[PDB]
Amino acid sequence: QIDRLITGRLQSLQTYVTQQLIRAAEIRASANLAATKMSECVLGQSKRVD
Amino acid sequence: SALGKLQDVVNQNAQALNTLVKQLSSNFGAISSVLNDILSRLDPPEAEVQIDRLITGRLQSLQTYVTQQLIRAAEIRASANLAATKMSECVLGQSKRVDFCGKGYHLMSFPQSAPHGVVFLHVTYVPAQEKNFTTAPAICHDGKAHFPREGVFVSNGTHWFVTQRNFYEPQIITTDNTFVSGNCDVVIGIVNNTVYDP
Amino acid sequence: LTGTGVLTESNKKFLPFQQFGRDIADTTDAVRILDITPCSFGGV
Amino acid sequence: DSTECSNLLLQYGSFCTQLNRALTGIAVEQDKNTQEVFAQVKQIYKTPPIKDFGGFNFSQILPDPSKPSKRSFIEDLLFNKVTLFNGLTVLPPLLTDEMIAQYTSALLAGTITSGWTFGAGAALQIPFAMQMAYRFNGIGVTQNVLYENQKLIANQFNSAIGKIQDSLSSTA
Amino acid sequence: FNGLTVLPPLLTDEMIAQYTSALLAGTITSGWTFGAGA
Amino acid sequence: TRAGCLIGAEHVNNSYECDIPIGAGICASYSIIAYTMSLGAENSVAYSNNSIAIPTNFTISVTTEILPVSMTKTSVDCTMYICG
Ligand SMILES: *[C@@H]1O[C@H](CO)[C@@H](O)[C@H](O)[C@H]1NC(C)=O
Ligand SMILES: *[C@@H]1O[C@H](CO)[C@@H](O)[C@H](O)[C@H]1NC(C)=O
Ligand SMILES: *[C@@H]1O[C@H](CO)[C@@H](O)[C@H](O)[C@H]1NC(C)=O
Ligand SMILES: *[C@@H]1O[C@H](CO)[C@@H](O)[C@H](O)[C@H]1NC(C)=O
Ligand SMILES: *[C@@H]1O[C@H](CO)[C@@H](O)[C@H](O)[C@H]1NC(C)=O
Ligand SMILES: *[C@@H]1O[C@H](CO)[C@@H](O)[C@H](O)[C@H]1NC(C)=O
Ligand SMILES: *[C@@H]1O[C@H](CO)[C@@H](O)[C@H](O)[C@H]1NC(C)=O
Known part of the structure; x- marks a missing residue:
């Protein structure tokens, strides 16, 4: 029974880690976009539309 | 350690591969981590249930490795898209974007090959050796407001010249490089000076 | 200890008290000295 | 804290090391993202008195000497509006709120004093009038347009900031 | 050795270097044209 | 500190560039010292409504940027890996 519980809890932890990794990738992309915006609009004037 | 990104990517890939290789030899609750020993030692029913346990463990490990590899591949694809954009903009032309192709006013870029990446040598222009000057938005001459076409009005201590923004090249204020727009009553900070007519 | 592979002359030096030898991944590499190198395999 | 769990997990493999490494890499990545986003300059410029x-x-976006954690009123509203065992711990960020706020203050001082230089x-x-004239020239508008409507443009900017703070105050 | 293979890249190191050299030569001798x- | 407690490093009242990031604004560097990392040089720009600063010289700066383009292509035979 303990082994079954271990397998279930480890599977749950794997799912949580995968979700966290996907969210981290999304947040990294958003942070790269924000850094680009700060570089090209706060440190200078951007001719790009919108 | 000047190529930390490529070395880090290689180290992560090697670490994932080594972790998978190590996990290949895990008991996973079975009597042994060697399949051949189980087959040459144990009866077909118990041998196949141990095989099922080992298969479950190894399949879970391989699934985890494949998920991490897919995430790393997506990250590498994003990095390669950024590198291709830099190649198209910084190398094949001149980019007006700030700090996209190096710190300062970007001049050009040179590509260099790397074992698992690319290197951009960004050649840029950086102002230095600055001096203070006194400015005025416009010049009130003959009851008319004169603004510089390109550059800025400055004065060292008493004489007013017109120069360019990024370099100190003073020039005599003249009607060719200045344009008139209205009188000198609405401009805030306008000063009185002569405008040379050639 | 059963397995499938190629028996090769080994240039490595064992010890009188050592019988088996395993490289990285904890897999059988040498058996008493003869080296075990699996026969060629790959994709097509 | 059960010994049987350790006994049954040592033979299971090393997935715990994998998860710990992944979490450490994620934390390092977020720290690097914050470092790249907020630290665009290496000099902390200060607004003249x-x-x-x-x-x-x-003064709406510049810090005030009232010590509200060295944040502007808009930053205070942004912080106030946002509302926030068993082996789970939260690692504090490398850059604190005060440090990020001082980066923001330095960036604001640089933008409003030196422009893009x-x-x-x-x-x-x-x-700032000459910087705005340069920016108008960037979008294809001559300097005299700014210079003959400086008061109107300043009033429009102040009104826009007022609507911004009103929206951030009541509108959710 | 356990079913793990490393597929060689389609573009060799020499070919990537030749791409870089061609791009650099075009940049110097022609600019952005x-x-x-x- | 709010990130925990550190033993073996002497706390100093100075501020240097961060070397080993401990967290919560606290860094460590090499005896081993622990401090609060400095954001950078602190300077005040002489702003005025009738004053400008214009450069009289220039510098041609060459910087290096590293960008990964690809990684090693690994193929795994599931039947061989799991079963052998
Ligand atoms: C000249 O400008 C610098 C800033 O670049 C300032 O520190 C200095 O005080 C200025 N000179 C005078 C005489 O005000
Ligand atoms: C400013 O420059 C003009 C022209 O070069 C010169 O005649 C004048 O003496 C200068 N004044 C000062 C204070 O340097
Ligand atoms: C600059 O501000 C001072 C007040 O400190 C004022 O006396 C002066 O007329 C102003 N000059 C311009 C050009 O606005
Ligand atoms: C410039 O000259 C006009 C008349 O010549 C005068 O009315 C005006 O006050 C002068 N400007 C300044 C700043 O003294
Ligand atoms: C800016 O706005 C604030 C709040 O409305 C006001 O207290 C302050 O006096 C204003 N500053 C100026 C220079 O008008
Ligand atoms: C504490 O910091 C202050 C200000 O930096 C400094 O004057 C003082 O010497 C420091 N004391 C110690 C014990 O480090
Ligand atoms: C600019 O700096 C270089 C050396 O970096 C020097 O040789 C040159 O004379 C300087 N320019 C001026 C106008 O002094």
Whole structure:
């Protein structure tokens, strides 16, 4: 029974880690976009539309 | 350690591969981590249930490795898209974007090959050796407001010249490089000076 | 200890008290000295 | 804290090391993202005590000596509006709120004093009217348009900031 | 050795170096003109 | 500190560039010292409504940027890996 519980809890932890990794990738992309915006609009004037 | 990104990517890939290789030899609750020993030692029913346990463990490990590899591949694809954009903009032309192709006013870029990446040598222009000057938005001459076409009005201590923004090249204020727009009553900070007519 | 592979002359030096030898991944590499190198395999 | 779990997990493998490494890498990545986003400059510029920007008002976005964690009123509203065992722990960020706020203050001072010159090297002082004239020239509008409507543009900017703070105050 | 293979890259190191050299030569000898046509 | 407690490093009242990031604004560097990392050089720009600063010289700066383009292509035979 303990082994079954271990397998279930480890599977749950794997799912949580995968979700966290996907969210981290999304947040990294958003942070790269924000850094680009700060570089090209706060440190200078951007001719790009919108 | 000047190529930390490529070395880090290689180290992560090697670490994932080594972790998978190590996990290949895990008991996973079975009597042994060697399949051949189980087959040459144990009866077909118990041998196949141990095989099922080992298969479950190894399949879970391989699934985890494949998920991490897919995430790393997506990250590498994003990095390669950024590198291709830099190649198209910084190398094949001149980019007006700030700090996209190096710190300062970007001049050009040179590509260099790397074992698992690319290197951009960004050649840029950086102002230095600055001096203070006194400015005025416009010049009130003959009851008319004169603004510089390109550059800025400055004065060292008493004489007013017109120069360019990024370099100190003073020039005599003249009607060719200045344009008139209205009188000198609405401009805030306008000063009185002569405008040379050639 | 059963397995499938190629028996090769080994240039490595064992010890009188050592019988088996395993490289990285904890897999059988040498058996008493003869080296075990699996026969060629790959994709097509 | 059961010994049987350790006994049954040592033979299971090393997935715990994998998860710990993944979490550490994620934390390092977020720290690097914050470091890249907020630390665009290596010099902490400060606004001069006298504020004569041609009528433009920046006391709304500049820090005040009242010590509200060294944040502007808009930053205070942004912080206030956002509302926030068993082996789970929260690692504090490398850059604190005060440090990020001081980065923001330095960036604001550089933008409102040196324009875009500090982003390409040393900060170069320039009157805000002339910086706005340069920016108007960037979008294809001559300097005289700014110079003959400086008061109107300053009033419009102040009104826009007022609507911004009103929206951030009541509108959710 | 356990079913793990490393697939060689399609483009060799020499070919990547030749791409970099060609791009650099076009940049020096032509500027940005070669990136928008002849 | 709010990130925990550190033993073996002497706390100093100075501020240097961060070397080993401990967290919560606290860094460590090499005896081993622990401090609060400095954001950078602190300077005040002489702003005025009738003053400008214009460069009289220039510098041609060459910087290096590293960008990964690809990684090693690994193929795994599931039947061989799991079963052998
Ligand atoms: C000249 O400008 C610098 C800033 O670049 C300032 O520190 C200095 O005080 C100025 N000189 C005078 C005489 O005010
Ligand atoms: C300013 O420059 C003009 C022209 O070069 C010169 O005649 C004048 O003496 C200068 N004044 C000062 C204070 O350097
Ligand atoms: C600059 O501000 C001072 C007040 O400190 C004022 O006396 C002066 O007329 C102003 N000059 C311009 C050009 O706005
Ligand atoms: C410039 O000259 C006009 C008349 O010549 C005068 O009315 C005006 O006050 C002068 N400007 C300044 C700043 O003294
Ligand atoms: C800017 O706005 C604030 C709040 O409305 C006000 O207290 C301050 O006096 C204004 N500054 C200027 C220079 O008008
Ligand atoms: C504490 O910091 C202050 C200010 O930096 C300094 O004057 C003082 O010497 C420091 N004391 C110690 C014990 O480090
Ligand atoms: C600019 O700096 C270089 C050396 O970096 C020097 O040789 C040159 O004379 C300087 N320019 C001026 C106008 O002094």
